[PDB]
Amino acid sequence: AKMAFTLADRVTEEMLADKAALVVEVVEENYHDAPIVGIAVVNEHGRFFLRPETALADPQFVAWLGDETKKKSMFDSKRAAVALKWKGIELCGVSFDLLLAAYLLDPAQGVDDVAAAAKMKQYEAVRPDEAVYGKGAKRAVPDEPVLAEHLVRKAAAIWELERPFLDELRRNEQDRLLVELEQPLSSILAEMEFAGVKVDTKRLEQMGKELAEQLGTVEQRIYELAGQEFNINSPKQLGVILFEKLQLPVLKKTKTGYSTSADVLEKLAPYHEIVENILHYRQLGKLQSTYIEGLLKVVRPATKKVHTIFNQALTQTGRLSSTEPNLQNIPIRLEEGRKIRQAFVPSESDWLIFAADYSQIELRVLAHIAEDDNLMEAFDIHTKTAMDIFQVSEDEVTPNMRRQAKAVNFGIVYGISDYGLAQNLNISRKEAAEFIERYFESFPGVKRYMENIVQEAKQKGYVTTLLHRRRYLPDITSRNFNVRSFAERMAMNTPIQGSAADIIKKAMIDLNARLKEERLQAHLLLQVHDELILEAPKEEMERLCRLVPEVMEQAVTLRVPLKVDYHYGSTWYDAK
DNA sequence: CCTGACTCC
DNA sequence: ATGGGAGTCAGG
Ligand SMILES: Nc1ccn([C@H]2CC[C@@H](COP(=O)(O)OP(=O)(O)OP(=O)(O)O)O2)c(=O)n1
Numbered sequence: 192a193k194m195a196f197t198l199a200d201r202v203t204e205e206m207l208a209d210k211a212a213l214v215v216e217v218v219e220e221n222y223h224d225a226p227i228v229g230i231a232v233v234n235e236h237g238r239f240f241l242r243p244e245t246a247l248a249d250p251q252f253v254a255w256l257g258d259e260t261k262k263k264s265m266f267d268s269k270r271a272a273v274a275l276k277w278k279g280i281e282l283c284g285v286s287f288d289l290l291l292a293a294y295l296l297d298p299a300q301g302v303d304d305v306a307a308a309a310k311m312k313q314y315e316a317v318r319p320d321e322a323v324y325g326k327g328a329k330r331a332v333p334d335e336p337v338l339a340e341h342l343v344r345k346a347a348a349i350w351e352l353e354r355p356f357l358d359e360l361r362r363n364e365q366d367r368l369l370v371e372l373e374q375p376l377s378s379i380l381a382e383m384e385f386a387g388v389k390v391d392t393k394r395l396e397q398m399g400k401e402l403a404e405q406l407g408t409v410e411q412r413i414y415e416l417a418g419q420e421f422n423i424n425s426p427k428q429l430g431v432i433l434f435e436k437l438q439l440p441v442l443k444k445t446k447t448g449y450s451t452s453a454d455v456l457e458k459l460a461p462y463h464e465i466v467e468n469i470l471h472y473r474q475l476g477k478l479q480s481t482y483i484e485g486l487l488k489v490v491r492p493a494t495k496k497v498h499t500i501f502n503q504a505l506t507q508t509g510r511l512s513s514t515e516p517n518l519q520n521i522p523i524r525l526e527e528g529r530k531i532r533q534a535f536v537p538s539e540s541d542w543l544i545f546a547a548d549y550s551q552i553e554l555r556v557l558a559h560i561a562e563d564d565n566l567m568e569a570f571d572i573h574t575k576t577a578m579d580i581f582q583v584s585e586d587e588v589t590p591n592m593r594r595q596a597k598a599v600n601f602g603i604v605y606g607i608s609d610y611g612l613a614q615n616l617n618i619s620r621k622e623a624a625e626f627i628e629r630y631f632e633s634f635p636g637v638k639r640y641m642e643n644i645v646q647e648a649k650q651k652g653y654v655t656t657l658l659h660r661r662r663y664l665p666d667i668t669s670r671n672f673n674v675r676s677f678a679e680r681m682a683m684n685t686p687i688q689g690s691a692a693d694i695i696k697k698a699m700i701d702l703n704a705r706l707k708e709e710r711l712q713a714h715l716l717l718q719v720h721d722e723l724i725l726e727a728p729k730e731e732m733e734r735l736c737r738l739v740p741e742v743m744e745q746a747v748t749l750r751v752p753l754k755v756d757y758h759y760g761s762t763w764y765d766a767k
Numbered sequence: 768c769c770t771g772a773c774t775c776c
Numbered sequence: 777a778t779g780g781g782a783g784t785c786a787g788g
Pocket residue numbers: 361364365366367368369657658659
């Protein structure tokens with residue numbers, strides 16, 4: 192702990208070297224329109240701290256941030272890039288991101304700050320962020336000398352750690368994953384987050400007013416049926432009503448008491464009509480609390496946009512997640528909740544929403560990977576399963592039936608048991624067991640594959656995706672049944688979900704390149720795991736109908752072709 | 768603050 | 777004991 196640095200009053204030439212570690216510090220977790228509290232630069236010439244008020248109003252420093260030929264190493268460069276966009280400054284030339292490097296080396300470490308990354312290489316010359324800024328109501332920027340040292344120490348760590356991390360990624364054959372996929376993706380995600388999605392608040396507010404009335408109506412009906420008022424949103428109070436007052440059968444318990452899960456309640460429907468009303472009430476309550484009230488809370492009022500943050504270094508399989516607000520779990524399955532999507536509108540007059548999704552991309556990936564003839568030949572496979580489990584005609588398969596059969600296809604291939612399946616379809620365990628057995632004989636390649644991948648994980652201690660993403664599974668040889676079994680099912684699932692994640696990431700990169708090449712105004716707004724959502728002038732729809740599916744299809748080559756479905760409309764709802 | 772709800776892929 | 781991966785909310 193002895194680190195020399197200049198606390199600079201003004202930007203100098205030697206801070207603008209062609210390679211540098213750069214820290215642009217934002218303390219708030221949600222970095223949209225958040226204060227930049229300090230800057231640190233480390234390069235061959237030395238270590239510098241700059242006050243943002245100075246640096247960011249300095250035309251040479253701004254010029255250097257925006258010069259792609261001046262290469263910067265950082266940690267969480269998307270955070271910096273977006274915070275700078277909100278200050279009206281363009282950040283270019285990021286060549287190394289320690290956050291993403293750590294994530295690829297081992298997603299389980301949960302690396303969230305430079306110190307946590309530094310620990311991976313026994314680098315101790317830097318403090319965790321939480322130790323410097325503090326928690327909750329105590330959270331604050333420290334005295335300048337202490338802030339400056341922290342930011343310089345983070346930059347020095349990035350400076351020293353770049354090579355050891357790159358060296359290890361190369362050993363793992365993952366450097367291209369970092370440099371050619373994840374880092375370019377981060378810049379595209381930064382663009383999407385900053386663009387935001389426009390919301391029709393008048394529509395959303397009116398929906399909430401009508402939902403309020405309907406909640407009250409259903410609530411009173413529940414009270415009438417129960418013979419008493421109680422808090423329907425307390426599973427504890429509800430448990431007393433259902434299982435003590437009304438004396439309904441107890442099908443399941445958790446550590447806190449009687450289960451009132453949707454699965455349990457649906458099975459109690461033939462006992463008392465109050466359970467169906469309660470399920471509906473909790474659905475309506477979620478719509479209001481989360482997708483009306485929670486959404487309106489994060490709308491920026493002047494522009495009516497919502498700006499999600501896509502976490503690129505969180506999931507254990509290589510998927511993104513979306514927070515504050517989560518735009519990857521907007522309702523769609525019930526028409527009631529689906530109507531929320533009518534409030535998601537284009538950001539400009541005479542623009543439209545364009546949505547494109549990979550049709551069953553994951554199952555095609557498994558077909559390719561497991562090398563299964565029957566599955567490939569099938570390449571509707573979900574509808575086909577609903578004809579089987581419900582024993583019906585193809586033109587009698589309701590979108591609820593198909594939805595149920597999709598859950599069965601994914602259940603089975605990823606190791607559901609006879610018990611789970613029996614519960615899911617409310618059928619006999621014998622019948623469920625024979626359903627699973629039949630599936631594995633119908634597709635013997637999938638069967639062989641799932642056996643092999645588990646043994647491979649036991650031998651190596653990890654599993655990998657098509658583009659060499661890695662998940663370590665140290666629990667996989669555990670003496671404990673439940674613990675071992677979970678790890679076995681991650682070996683079955685992670686390579687396929689993770690590979691499907693790799694592919695759509697590549698597609699986003701490819702797509703943006705083409706949009707730029709063709710000088711289109713169309714741009715990405717959202718990714719929802721197997722779907723890309725764009726907005727564009729209405730004139731570009733014709734072109735987008737060919738371009739976007741073209742690019743997605745040709746992202747990778749597999750034994751099975753990738754298929755893209757696409758729709759467009761006035762609102763997200765209408766993009767179906 | 769965690770748990771168990773509901774939401775999506 | 778009992779397919780996988782996520783985030784947000786009210787209650788307690
Ligand atoms: N140094 C490397 C090499 C590869 N990869 C990732 C990028 C794409 C994917 C493909 O691996 P390649 O060796 O480029 O192609 P391959 O012939 O299919 O090799 P393999 O079958 O082992 O994946 O792995 C990487 O991240 N870093």
